[PDB]
Amino acid sequence: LRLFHGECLTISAADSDDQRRLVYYEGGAVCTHARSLWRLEPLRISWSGSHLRWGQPLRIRHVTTGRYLALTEDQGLVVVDACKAHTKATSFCFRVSKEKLKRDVEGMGPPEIKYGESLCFVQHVASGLWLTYAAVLKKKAILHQEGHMDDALFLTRCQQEESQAARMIHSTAGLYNQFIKGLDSFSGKPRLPIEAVILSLQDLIGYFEPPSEELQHEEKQSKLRSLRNRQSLFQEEGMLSLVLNCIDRLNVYTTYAGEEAAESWKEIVNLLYELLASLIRGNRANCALFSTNLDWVVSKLDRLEASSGILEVLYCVLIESPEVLNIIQENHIKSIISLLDKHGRNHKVLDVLCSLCVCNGVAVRSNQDLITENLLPGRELLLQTNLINYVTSIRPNIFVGGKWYFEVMVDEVVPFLTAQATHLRVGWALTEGYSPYPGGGEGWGGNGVGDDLYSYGFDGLHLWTGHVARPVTSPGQHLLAPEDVVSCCLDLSVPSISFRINGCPVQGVFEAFNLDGLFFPVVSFSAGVKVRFLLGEFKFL
């Protein structure tokens, strides 16, 4: 329970200069925070849960540290470890009045100290002092012989969920810290709680699992606010700092520690990120804790060990944090996109990048243009697209094994019908592997997409093999005019081919061929364009 002063009792926040010892009164945000909490333990084992009786001795216990409050000569009044917390140094009692002023009750006992209404002066029975405070907002408390009248501390119950959370903070810190100290032991010693730890990780992840969409809205928002609350409740106590430094110490390796342990390690690290994600699914402030830390996340984006979980993390960081969207710059996005290159089309990645691109409401234009310059112009990465015109080919009914020749007069070429130039490759091709399926055939499809293919004409005439547009010169240096007469030649065994525009040579061309195929003439075409075959009505001989 909390101890409201009229504002409430608490200790120093996590990772304090104090080493979390000295007590303080404080108002503000801490009142909702867990470090404000204080378990009240009567000295008796039995019937401790009996109604608190005025003036009975009781150890007070801060939960999140687990430590017991005590008078101490060494540092004045301080909360302190139980091992040092002998009862003489730490007894206390609640009372109606400043005046000064017995038998145990093995039963629930008489009702007395109501929450929020039964004010209760604190007193240390072993010394007879009082919980005075000295006269920023850190109104520090120390024991003292007197104490002015507003010193009264009316009590207020903690929520179930919250105290569960806090004790959970104690167990959690108390496991991960010794995990870390154990990680340090072999960092300098090439050659550990573990499954104890992993159970805690899975359980902390279960404890933070966001509510289902399947839930009705009211229960959903309730469980959701409870979720945000618990997230903050691990936030103030440095659970994020803890998980991040555990991830820091676990990121050193891709494996020291014995092999018995190392096999679980790949789980642990990844599990941690999952755990980490859970603390930042919703609450913005934790993302604000990552605002300075983003570069860290980015490096760990590139780790490719735990892999995807670091990405889900970063995505949780971005989806709910304008600050983080502001701070991010060249390197980080270039590393993100580089991850897109390094895994291959996770859609999560693009979700991360659009989440970078637009904060909830406002746009962040530098980030936008940066996404553009580091994605779009290269074109090599994400699925580029275009409205291609169909190619379609036809051949004379009979193929070829001696030497052979055929003309193909052009009839009616329309250059830029539609956006594309109309396709008219013409030339030899083998049966065994040339299967020009009309819908998409490598590159943008068409004749000449294959080694099997041996082609000529179209767009300055010249030739295609493999796919390459090799621009052999011709005396006319022309395409295929509707008047034009394509001319084609071939020999058996000898791999020679040569072409003529309007009955005159277009130099030598490509040579060596498989005889594995049985060659046939090909006339590819597109749009409304038509052409006369001339297998021999020759107009040139």
């Binding site: 936008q368 074109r379 994400l382 580029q384 697209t385 275009n386 998409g440 490598e442 006369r532």
Partner: protein, 613 residues
Amino acid sequence: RMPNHFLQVETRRAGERLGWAVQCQDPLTMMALHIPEENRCMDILELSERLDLQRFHSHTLRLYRAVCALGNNRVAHALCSHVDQAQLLHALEDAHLPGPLRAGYYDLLISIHLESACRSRRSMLSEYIVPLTPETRAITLFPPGLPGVGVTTSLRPPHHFSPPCFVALSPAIPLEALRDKALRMLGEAVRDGGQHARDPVGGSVEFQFVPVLKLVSTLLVMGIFGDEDVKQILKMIEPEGLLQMKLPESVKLQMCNLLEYFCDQELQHRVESLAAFAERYVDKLQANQRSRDFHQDLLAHCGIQLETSLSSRLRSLLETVRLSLQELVSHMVVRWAQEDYVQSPELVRAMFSLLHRQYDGLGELLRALPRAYTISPSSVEDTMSLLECLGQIRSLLIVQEENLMIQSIGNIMNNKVFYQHPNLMRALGMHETVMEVMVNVLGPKMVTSCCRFLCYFCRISRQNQRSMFDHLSYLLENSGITPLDVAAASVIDNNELALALQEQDLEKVVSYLAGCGLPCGGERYLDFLRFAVFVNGESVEENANVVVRLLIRKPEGLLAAIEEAIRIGHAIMSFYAALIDLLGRCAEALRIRAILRSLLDDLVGIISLPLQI
């Protein structure tokens, strides 16, 4: 072997003999994405099987749609370089794409082109600032109801599509061919859906309609369409039908938005016709008053009549102000909630926003009027220069960025209307925008022009100065270090306004002086207090007292510090000067004079300052 699409329609072979004349008739085209990494082209229509890439690619479309960024356009041209215009149009025309992709390309056609223009348009569509042109006179609240008339006029700044040129602001499409296309799409949708044939285009009715009704909805909020096309829309809705169709809880939302454009436009025509009557009646009445400031009160005397035979003309037109979409909207919303238990709250909120707009259109007018503001026909062009600038700053409200706002606020500074019609300016709420940007910036050297703007905005009028005065607690909480001299400009003039201020504001300011125990910020705060108290002549006591009570405690041999400042920076001496000045502006209240005599105790400062010449 890998199965793939047979190609839904394929080429016309037309061969024969003699020379064997192979032939063709018409072009056909693949919508072909490729994968460069595998260097394999593929038609996107095939993509509805290897659906992992469907997800990836639909998210690429989310990324383009996102990177175009709402209010961004420099980026969009590149998106023209990629997504390709014609490719979009083919993406719309065909009705075999899988639906996330389909809706993704409609979303791109919205974003890359139409969306930014729609942002420029909507915020001004909320405004009702009609010209007193002769064209805006023969409107009449009734035709000699039915929305979508071409006489809507107002000002409402023109769209600016820069053509997507790549040799060397917003990307261009053919607006009319596209309006016709989208119109044909709604018609094809009403038909094919009305026969209840069930392809269903997108693999869902949602994909069959929602993207298209979206495209038409932005397209129509944009003001593209020209009377008869709007008639096509309304005939495809009411008819008087897409509205009567059975629907998924999604398309209904788009119907809610489209119909919301109809009702909003109807409000446009209503307020506009009422203003046209302001001309048609006031031109008459002014001749009546001249046949025989406070003139406004006399106009209120003209407005007392309902409780000078011109009054009967009012007694008809008010009944015109009483007003069949008014049937169907209420009936349909009520049918929708009645038969379905609709979920997705957004659809609901749209529904009953529509519904409250329907049962209380007189009040919709009553809220619409203050934003409406009649304008002289000659000057409107300047407002045409004005509004677009506001659009610009309103583009900046949702975000270099700074140069635009500077040059735009300057363009607003230069305008003649910004002199001549301050009421329009506060009616636009534009200062609230400029403050909004002002605060988004605060959390530099863009702040500055904004402050000159809010200060001069204080200068232009006192009634407007109170309008700036409302924000002072906000403006001061925002001033951690200048907005504070903007507040000073807010407080500078009116005595009633200096009395109007809460003690809490001066408390905030003096708390800022409590934060200045270590400066120039302090002399700034003291200056705000200076305008706060001294007012025009002897300082108002009501504020001066409170300011001194606050300065008893916060702005902390102090006179030695003057000579210590003289031995040298001097800004501390400027702070002590501002302080002794602020205490020099304070004189029941006899005791406070003793409080100030307590700090002559001066004397030596005038001699030391004279010796430091």
